[PDB]
Subunit: 343 residues, 4 copies
Amino acid sequence: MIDLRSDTVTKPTEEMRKAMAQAEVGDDVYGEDPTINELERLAAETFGKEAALFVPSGTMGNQVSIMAHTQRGDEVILEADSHIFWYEVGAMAVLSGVMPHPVPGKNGAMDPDDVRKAIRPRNIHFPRTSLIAIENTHNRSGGRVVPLENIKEICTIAKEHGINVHIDGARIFNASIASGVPVKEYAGYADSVMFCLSKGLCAPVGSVVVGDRDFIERARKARKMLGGGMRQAGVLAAAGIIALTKMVDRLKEDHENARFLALKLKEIGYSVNPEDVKTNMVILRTDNLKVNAHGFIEALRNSGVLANAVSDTEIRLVTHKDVSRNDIEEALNIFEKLFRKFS
Amino acid sequence: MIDLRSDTVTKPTEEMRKAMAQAEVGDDVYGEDPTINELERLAAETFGKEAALFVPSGTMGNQVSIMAHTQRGDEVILEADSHIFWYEVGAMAVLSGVMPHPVPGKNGAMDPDDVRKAIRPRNIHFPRTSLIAIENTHNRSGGRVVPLENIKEICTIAKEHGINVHIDGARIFNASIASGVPVKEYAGYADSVMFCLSKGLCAPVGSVVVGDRDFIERARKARKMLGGGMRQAGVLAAAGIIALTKMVDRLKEDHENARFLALKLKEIGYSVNPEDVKTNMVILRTDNLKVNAHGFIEALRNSGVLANAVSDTEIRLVTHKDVSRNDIEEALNIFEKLFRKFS
Amino acid sequence: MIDLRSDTVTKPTEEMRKAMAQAEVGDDVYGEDPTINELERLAAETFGKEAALFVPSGTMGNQVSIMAHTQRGDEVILEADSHIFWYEVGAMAVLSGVMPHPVPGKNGAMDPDDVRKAIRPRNIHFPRTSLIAIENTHNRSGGRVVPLENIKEICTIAKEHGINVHIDGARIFNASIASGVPVKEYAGYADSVMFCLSKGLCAPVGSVVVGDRDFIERARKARKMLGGGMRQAGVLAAAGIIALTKMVDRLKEDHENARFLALKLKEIGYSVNPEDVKTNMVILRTDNLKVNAHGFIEALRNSGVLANAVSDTEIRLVTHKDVSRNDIEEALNIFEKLFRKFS
Amino acid sequence: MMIDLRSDTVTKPTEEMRKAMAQAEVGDDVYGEDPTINELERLAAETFGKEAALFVPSGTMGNQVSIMAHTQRGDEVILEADSHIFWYEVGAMAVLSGVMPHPVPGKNGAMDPDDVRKAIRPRNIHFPRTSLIAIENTHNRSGGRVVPLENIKEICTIAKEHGINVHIDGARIFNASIASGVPVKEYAGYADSVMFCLSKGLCAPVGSVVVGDRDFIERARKARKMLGGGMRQAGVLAAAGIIALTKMVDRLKEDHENARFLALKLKEIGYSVNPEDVKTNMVILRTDNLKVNAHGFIEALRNSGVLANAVSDTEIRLVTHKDVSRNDIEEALNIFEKLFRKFS
Ligand SMILES: [Ca+2]
Ligand SMILES: [Ca+2]
Ligand SMILES: [Ca+2]
Ligand SMILES: [Ca+2]
Ligand SMILES: [Ca+2]
Ligand SMILES: [Ca+2]
Ligand SMILES: [Cl-]
Ligand SMILES: [Cl-]
Ligand SMILES: [Cl-]
Ligand SMILES: [Cl-]
Ligand SMILES: [Cl-]
Ligand SMILES: [Cl-]
């Protein structure tokens, strides 16, 4: 089928499958897996940080970072529509015993003044604000790119207050491709960055957290506690190395396909805004259709297209390596036929 | 001094001091303190609930209620400027491992539709919404009365979804006096209610939580875990009974004094809204002054008036039994003089 | 009835009742209650520490100390039969996220070598041992006194490893009176000490934690989070000052009464060991009786004597101010009758 | 290279596993669409006679999501005093679940049922609620000892009477089964949940599996999401797991035979070992009759080409597995014999 549900569905490339088969492994608990070690070295180097830590998921990456940055009772400033707040099972409260302090943002960009204002003064009644999280290519807003200036401004505020900064960079490479800002530049304004290998980069499993050596050591212990301490994970790291070093540039193709898809959907008559498509995501409203988002998703599936409804009136279409231009053209033929039926 | 910082500064009445001296006591851990037992019996009766639990503070009252209503990883819907979120040291995250889900409100009144939208659907990525908290006479907005209709609507939504409702009624009697709604009526739309004895009611220590027998049993065990299980606490309960049974009616005097204070401050030229003052609080804005809230608080202190800044531009003035009309008149003379200096 | 269940049942003396009624108070949240302030000053001075914190219960005292001494995932070494492990509702795990590391002891004295062995090496699999707790006049062993030499040796081990030491001194004054070791000497070999005012010292409510200024500041914030931040608690502190300054010497009377009780029970034929009784507790075994401990407790209750079973073959008898020699004599007459019935 | 007797965790993937992983049919596990993970879980559930199963990245996560699914904050978990959950899991039970461990000493990993019964908390405001009893099969610290089925049966009876959940940390449950002749489904029949490792003696590179009832597994799956174990195309790992479960269990007998040989021969040399206690893949060696300590002996072994771990200042643990052959054992023994001359 044509899977436009998310970039998480990407499958390993032939190069990855071969590398996994001949991957040199060792027990990572003893720090003896050579491939995991190289992946972490490469990740650190790539983001200009002192160290890196491989994790089974982006969620664990964010959570071990929060654990390594905070103490029980602390407060974490984050954007009101960020993944850490909405889609991580309330892990920050259970695992770290910290409270989120949602701050509204415009497509992932929290007004620096609102962030500064959300910082807690020192008083016995108040939690200590110890961390500020920023999500780049903010998902809920539709894969929008947070301006480098916004991140720089917030980094300055954090510095003045002695507050740590964490960038949820699950799709930071998509941000870099769209903005032209090198990932090292983003990373420089943060204490830690979590980036996914299993989404647009096509690795089957995992993410990586990069930051200072002491922070990473604390995160590695947190990883052990959470259950992310694997044995011969070099098999996964082999695909991870290829994802990090050879699958970044082509993300531009996903962006081009998403824009093309949006432009053509608008032409057909669907409620989409091509001008809002900055990375690999397209938001499709169903207000003008005879069935709502849930009913339309079912019609799409029957015709060979997979997508998710994010509300009763919205569907999200996401492009990635396993959605070629031919697939986009085929999907458009299907959307054309369904518009005749459901408009 | 003329202490307008909070109604918590109220000192025991002569009748309270004597009652504490002759209080009949016992070991509360064994449930043998007769005065604590009578206080809880009286509180439950007054609020139309099955049981009650005495606690050393309102913070503990709120926190044991959250513990008794939730499980780790749950989410708690509460108003964005509520005390549980801002002034309770992030306790909900540490003690219950729950995540707050802030919802904007108009003077403490969360739009029922927004509350409905904040409820989490059943999905692996989401925490379970198990509690909705409403604060009556919302502190931050200026001791504002939450409309009974608001509470009724939210109660209905909660019932629909099988969600618990907790009323932070620290100043519920102030609300009752101003609105004319009996506290028993407010309580009927909630599963639990925490009310303070140590604020406007003048008791030196404590609050009480009322609710169903099984919930109170869970709250009592939580109280033991938190360290609120005292011994001969009947000494405190003696004053509590008097606070509950003899100090409710006179709260009207505090409301009169607060309104008078606000009216006269407006005439002087200060940025206050007398029409918004319905209970014992007055929010004073410093945007039209030469110094901010922190600087003005210091000036007030030097002239005999104590108050707290609640932001860089807002000051909260609170009236209570230990601030007479004469004290208010004296404070106004001071405010008058300071307007000449800082306007 | 004749209450030998615990020393927690002690009621206020007339002097205490008068002091509570005339207590000079203030709002403790602002650090303005003069009596709480003097109690803390006196407590610190008496224990030779720079700071102190009044709390509603010994449980809260121990728990805020644990919170202030540890970080999530840490381990706390403690005696296998200590109160923090057995009678504090699993609070250490919930509030501080720490693991208890039980170490056997002989009448409360953990072998220093066993303590050194229980300290965790630096390994990713292990929690960090950050606290060692010692209970003085160890309850479960029968109110036994831990030798100063034991505490001194453990203190040295702790210093070598940079580990904190907390003394659960709920009954530290009983230990001091029996041993001749001043409480400031026990405390000199510890970082913090919690002692109760509501047991043998006869105050109706509360305990105090003593320690260094920074530690107490953290413990004070923990107290706020837990709900121990009261307002005009000076009413309680007034009785607390009398407990600390005037009720310590008479503890020798409780020790004398416990010894007399034990000697006479032995004379009757009960299985008691007068040689093990050095403070205010007597352990009686039901080994030579035709009933178990629980059945014996019931028989005692029906005859006018209250006590607690601590196992299926052992019951604990505790003396205090409210069980006079006359009461011990009357209890013995009852014990004599019951011995003929169940022996 | 060196003879690695440190642990069975160092086992490397077999040729068949490597090919199956690289060519694995995958899908997004978050959507429950990875076919290989689904088959691994189906097979695991079937093997243990349970309704459902959950793949996890580590045995630690397997145990922790089980504790989370079985308990509520403030609860107490009865477990053996020297069990892995208490000693080697970073205090996770306290941080993640807010529960207190209630250590019960055991005899060769087996807790006396009456001691377990006595450890259950009475209902009292001062006491946490006992909601879970955990049993470790082939108890590691005691030397990979096999807990009798009757011990587990008796504890199950006590738990049922009290309405308490039972979890078996079966990291090496297949080693227990091969040695005892007891099918793993029989051990599991007396438990609510069982966690077993695929990455130790079974030779898979990564992961473990938790088995149990449908509702419990659903709760454990949500816990797994919270802890960060919700992976995407994990079928790559599951492919090796299927082979571990289907083709690597029987040969564990070889690891046991190698460990028995090692123990018998070490005894013959003069080392303080008890061949009579060796029934699975572990040998405990005490350094009581050596002029060196445990850590010093480990260093000496390293210098001679043998890798082992000290588990006490006087105890070393030797573990056999697929990657240590009989010839490797003979080599280690010949070295042990000489080092006995130097340190005795
Ligand atoms: Ca993928
Ligand atoms: Ca008061
Ligand atoms: Ca008392
Ligand atoms: Ca007499
Ligand atoms: Ca392996
Ligand atoms: Ca050979
Ligand atoms: Cl290899
Ligand atoms: Cl912490
Ligand atoms: Cl009385
Ligand atoms: Cl829970
Ligand atoms: Cl006063
Ligand atoms: Cl595939």
